[PDB]
């Protein structure tokens, strides 16, 4: 006979991704570099996570899980020539000038040479060869030339430099990052022109592309947009380091990206900070908050986030004060990004099709309520789905925990 049986085959987004454009002294230029928190950055960036040169990378990764780094400058490669041999830095930048070539006749076999590459006096590579041909590039330099080698007690590479970056380099960055999935961008620059461009960039992705992200700038409350956070002051670290507001954007961006949809940065302390710079009076803080500024306040030897807010200050009936709270933005961006992902991946405009979509959204909203991201959500009335012949409309009410006013959510799906 024939026996047949059937069985089902079963099958909230994650944030944590920050991106930052930087001017460096080493590293591959104009190409997005991905660094996971805890990763050894010496190989890729030529510096230690603790070298002052990588301070911003260190700060961004205090709260973020992944950093999308973009080096804006190619700089000039340092180099040196000894006889027939030319040694050139792998990447352009002033870091190349910390490299020194050492060529000494091998002790065991006088017909060979020991070619060592030193960085800050430390030997990081040593190759024993007969001639230049036998040499192989390493993680620091490229060997060029032909013929026999010549000894040298020390031949430091020179002419290396970072050079000057063009504002156009930031345009290349934005284009490259736009293709990646990320949550927040930090602009550790005081350039007013760049701030305006990043502000426009945020508005386009968020409201024209449906790609919800945020940009963190330094002293630019003029943005007056929920997609932009403006850091007013900096902090003082336990090691004595004073970070400017521009430098502080790194941590703020990382913290914002790392923050969960149910978490607010309000009164959280800037990791490692023991004071703020500058300090403000009660009146100045109030004025700053009213102006839409993200600022730190000193308390009990810590730098606390006064209020986790973005630059939006021109509130309207359709976009109230709740939109100024970054946690509100995280929950709403989560709804947006997740929905777009769920519908585009797992999803006809008919009774059953609409019912199934409605069920999946209700389950999603219930999950947000379970993690205390929203409250007072009643799946029995807070979400509906109505039917253009192939257009589906979804209406729902979401109540963010940090808001005493419900938010209307309208979803338009086309097939």
- Measured CA to CA, the distance from residue 358 to residue 300 in angstroms comes to 49
Question: CB-based contacts of 162: which residues, under 8 Å, 6+ apart?
Answer: 23, 24, 25, 73, 75, 92, 93, 94
Method used for this model? Answer: X-ray
Which helix (H) or strand (E) covers residue 303, if one does? strand 302-305
DSSP 46: S
- Measured CA to CA, the distance from residue 250 to residue 227 in angstroms comes to 16
CATH code for 75-164?
A: 2.60.40.4290
Relative to beta strand 184-186, strand 17-22 is parallel
Q: Can you tell me whether residue 99 is helix, strand or coil?
A: strand
CATH code for 165-230+310-346?
A: 3.40.50.11790
CATH 3.40.50.11790 spans which residues of the chain? 165-230+310-346
CATH code for 231-309?
A: 3.30.1370.220
Pull the structure tokens for residue 131: 């001639």
Q: In what order do the strands lie in the sheet with 99-105?
A: 122-129, 113-119, 99-105, 152-156
- SS in 3 state form for 112-179? CEEEEEEECCEEEEEEEECCCCCCCCCCCEEEECCCCCCCEEEEECECCECCCCCHHHHHHHHHHHCC
- Measured CA to CA, the distance from residue 293 to residue 233 in angstroms comes to 9
DSSP 206: I
Find the angle CA(353)-CA(356)-CA(358) to the nearest 5 degrees: 110
CATH 3.30.1490.360 spans which residues of the chain? 11-74
- Measured CA to CA, the distance from residue 103 to residue 150 in angstroms comes to 7
In words, the CATH class of domain 11-74 is: alpha beta
- Measured CA to CA, the distance from residue 383 to residue 355 in angstroms comes to 11
Resolution of this entry in Å? 1.9
The DSSP bridge partners found for residue 33 are 69
Q: Can you tell me whether residue 313 is helix, strand or coil?
A: coil
- Measured CA to CA, the distance from residue 104 to residue 150 in angstroms comes to 8
Nearest to 103 by CA among 156, 150, 139: 150
The torsion region of residue 198 among left (phi > 0), alpha (psi -120 to 50) and beta comes to alpha
CATH 3.30.360.90 spans which residues of the chain? 347-415
CATH 3.30.1370.220 spans which residues of the chain? 231-309
Upper half-sphere CA count for residue 314 (Cβ side, 13 Å): 5
In words, the CATH class of domain 347-415 is: alpha beta
Instruction: Classify burial at 223, counting beta carbons within 10 Å of its beta carbon; exposed 0-12, middle 13-18, buried 19 or more.
Output: buried
Nearest to 338 by CA among 314, 360, 371, 315: 360
Peptide bond into 53 cis (omega under 30): no
Pull the structure tokens for residue 311: 């630059």
Relative to beta strand 302-305, strand 391-398 is unpaired
């Amino acid at each position: 006979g024939v026996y047949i049986n059937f069985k089902s085959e079963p099958q909230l987004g994650e944030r944590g991704i920050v991106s930052m454009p930087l001017i460096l002294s080493w590293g591959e230029p104009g190409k997005m570099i991905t660094i996971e928190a805890g990763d050894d950055v010496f190989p890729k960036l030529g510096y230690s996570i603790m070298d002052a040169q990588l301070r911003l990378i260190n700060e961004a990764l205090k709260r973020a899980k992944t950093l999308l780094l973009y080096r804006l400058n190619a700089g000039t490669k340092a180099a040196v020539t000894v006889g027939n041999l030319t040694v050139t830095a792998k990447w352009g930048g002033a870091r190349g000038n910390d490299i020194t070539l050492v060529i000494q006749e091998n002790i065991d076999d006088e017909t060979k040479f020991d070619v060592s590459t030193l960085v800050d006096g430390a030997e990081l590579d040593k190759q024993t060869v007969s001639d230049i041909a036998g040499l192989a590039a390493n993680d620091w330099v490229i060997f060029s030339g032909t013929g026999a080698l010549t000894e040298t007690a020390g031949a430091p590479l020179i002419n290396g430099s970072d050079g000057a970056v063009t504002n156009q380099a930031y345009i290349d960055y934005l284009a490259a990052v736009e293709i990646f999935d990320f949550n927040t961008i930090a602009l550790p620059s005081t350039d007013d022109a760049l701030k305006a461009t990043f502000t426009a960039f945020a508005k386009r992705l968020r409201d024209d592309e449906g790609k919800k992200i945020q940009v963190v700038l330094e002293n630019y409350p003029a943005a007056d947009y929920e997609g932009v956070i403006s850091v007013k002051n900096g902090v003082v670290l336990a090691d004595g380091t004073i970070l400017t507001a521009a430098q502080a954007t790194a941590w703020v961006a990382g913290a914002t990206a790392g923050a969960r949809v149910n978490e607010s940065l309000t009164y959280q302390g800037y990791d490692e900070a023991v004071d703020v710079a500058p300090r403000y009076t009660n009146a100045q803080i109030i004025a700053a908050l009213q102006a839409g500024e993200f600022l730190f306040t000193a308390s009990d030897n810590q730098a606390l986030v006064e209020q986790d807010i973005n630059t939006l200050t021109s509130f309207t009936a359709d976009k109230g004060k709740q939109f100024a709270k970054n946690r509100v933005i995280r929950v709403l961006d989560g709804i947006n990004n997740d929905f777009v992902r769920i519908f585009s991946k797992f999803y006809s405009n008919n009774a059953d099709g609409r019912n199934l979509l409605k069920s999946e959204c209700i389950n999603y909203m219930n999950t947000l309520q379970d993690i205390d991201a929203i409250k007072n959500f009643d799946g029995q009335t807070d979400l509906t789905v109505q039917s253009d012949v192939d257009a589906v409309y979804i209406e729902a009410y979401a109540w963010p925990v940090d808001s005493i006013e419900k938010i209307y959510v309208r979803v338009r799906i086309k097939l």
